[PDB]
Design a protein around this motif. Structure first.
Motif, PDB file in Angstrom:
ATOM      1  N   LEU A  29      41.724  45.558  44.487  1.00 19.92           N
ATOM      2  CA  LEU A  29      41.231  44.181  44.503  1.00 19.92           C
ATOM      3  C   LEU A  29      39.894  44.050  45.207  1.00 19.92           C
ATOM      4  CD1 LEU A  29      44.616  42.640  45.785  1.00 19.92           C
ATOM      5  CD2 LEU A  29      44.051  43.170  43.438  1.00 19.92           C
ATOM      6  N   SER A  30      39.672  44.861  46.240  1.00 18.71           N
ATOM      7  CA  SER A  30      38.357  44.966  46.868  1.00 18.71           C
ATOM      8  C   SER A  30      37.304  45.420  45.863  1.00 18.71           C
ATOM      9  CB  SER A  30      38.416  45.934  48.057  1.00 18.71           C
ATOM     10  OG  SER A  30      37.318  46.823  48.031  1.00 18.71           O
ATOM     11  N   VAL A  32      37.249  39.600  49.454  1.00 15.43           N
ATOM     12  CA  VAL A  32      38.670  39.648  49.683  1.00 15.43           C
ATOM     13  C   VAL A  32      39.165  41.085  49.598  1.00 15.43           C
ATOM     14  CG1 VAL A  32      39.023  37.296  48.990  1.00 15.43           C
ATOM     15  CG2 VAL A  32      39.100  39.095  47.267  1.00 15.43           C
ATOM     16  N   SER A  33      40.268  41.317  50.293  1.00 10.96           N
ATOM     17  CA  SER A  33      40.735  42.646  50.621  1.00 10.96           C
ATOM     18  C   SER A  33      42.259  42.645  50.690  1.00 10.96           C
ATOM     19  CB  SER A  33      40.113  43.100  51.951  1.00 10.96           C
ATOM     20  OG  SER A  33      38.699  42.944  51.985  1.00 10.96           O
ATOM     21  N   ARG A  36      37.632  45.332  42.505  1.00  8.98           N
ATOM     22  CA  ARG A  36      37.599  44.379  41.395  1.00  8.98           C
ATOM     23  C   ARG A  36      36.775  43.144  41.745  1.00  8.98           C
ATOM     24  NH1 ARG A  36      38.993  39.904  41.935  1.00  8.98           N
ATOM     25  NH2 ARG A  36      39.976  40.611  43.880  1.00  8.98           N
ATOM     26  N   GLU A  37      36.986  42.601  42.946  1.00  7.99           N
ATOM     27  CA  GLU A  37      36.109  41.584  43.527  1.00  7.99           C
ATOM     28  C   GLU A  37      34.668  42.058  43.661  1.00  7.99           C
ATOM     29  OE1 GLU A  37      34.413  39.679  46.407  1.00  7.99           O
ATOM     30  OE2 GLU A  37      33.841  41.753  46.867  1.00  7.99           O
TER      31      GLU A  37
END
Lengths: 100, 82
Positions: free
Chosen positions: A96-97, B60-61, A99-100
């Motif tokens: 997600l890091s 975000v993480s 992908r963001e």
């Protein structure tokens, strides 16, 4: 994508009935508009992107393709040009890091 | 040789983190289910640095949504990225 051909026909007609003394104003042939070639847009490991340090190297080369017009393995360009803000589809199962 | 069975105050990085989860479990017993303060693990150091430095970019993480004292140390730099 096709309404531009209507626009070209209207501006064609405007210059044609305006300048009535010279030879017919130049045109492109239709295939120059009908090509997808001229517009810039047109074994891949199903591990579900497990390895965290290798995910950066895989997505950054897909990025190096996507910066200049090419859909990636994990990123993918959505089939608009309906609109003009052309959105992209990354792989769902990513870090997600990243992908963001 | 038969060495001096590691005196506590010098033997850490595993035995102190074992020890933190021991006093955490003790306080949870003295409460009795009404505390239940888990997650005394996870993960590493350098990736957490790239994580917190990423929080300054707005990112975000895994632990940033939108021992155990690293939550306070992490809030001091989380509220910077907000």
């Amino acid at each position: 994508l096709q309404q531009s051909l209507e626009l070209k026909r209207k501006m064609l007609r405007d210059k044609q009935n305006k300048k009535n003394s010279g030879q017919h104003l130049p045109i492109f042939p239709a295939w120059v508009y009908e090509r997808p070639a001229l517009i810039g847009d047109f074994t891949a490991l199903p591990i579900g992107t497990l390895p965290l340090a290798s995910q950066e190297s895989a997505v950054v080369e897909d990025l190096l393709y996507v910066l200049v017009g090419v859909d990636g393995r994990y990123v993918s360009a959505q089939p608009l040009a309906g609109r003009q803000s052309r959105t992209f589809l990354v792989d769902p199962n990513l870090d997600l890091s990243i992908r963001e | 040789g038969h060495r001096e069975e590691p005196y506590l105050t010098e033997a850490g990085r595993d035995a102190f983190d074992k020890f933190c989860r021991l006093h955490q479990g003790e306080l949870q017993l003295l409460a009795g289910g009404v505390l239940q303060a888990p997650q005394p693990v996870l993960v590493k150091e350098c990736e957490l640095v790239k994580d917190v430095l990423n929080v300054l970019i707005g990112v975000v993480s895994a632990t940033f949504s939108l021992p155990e004292s690293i939550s306070s140390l992490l809030s001091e730099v989380a509220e910077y990225g907000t």
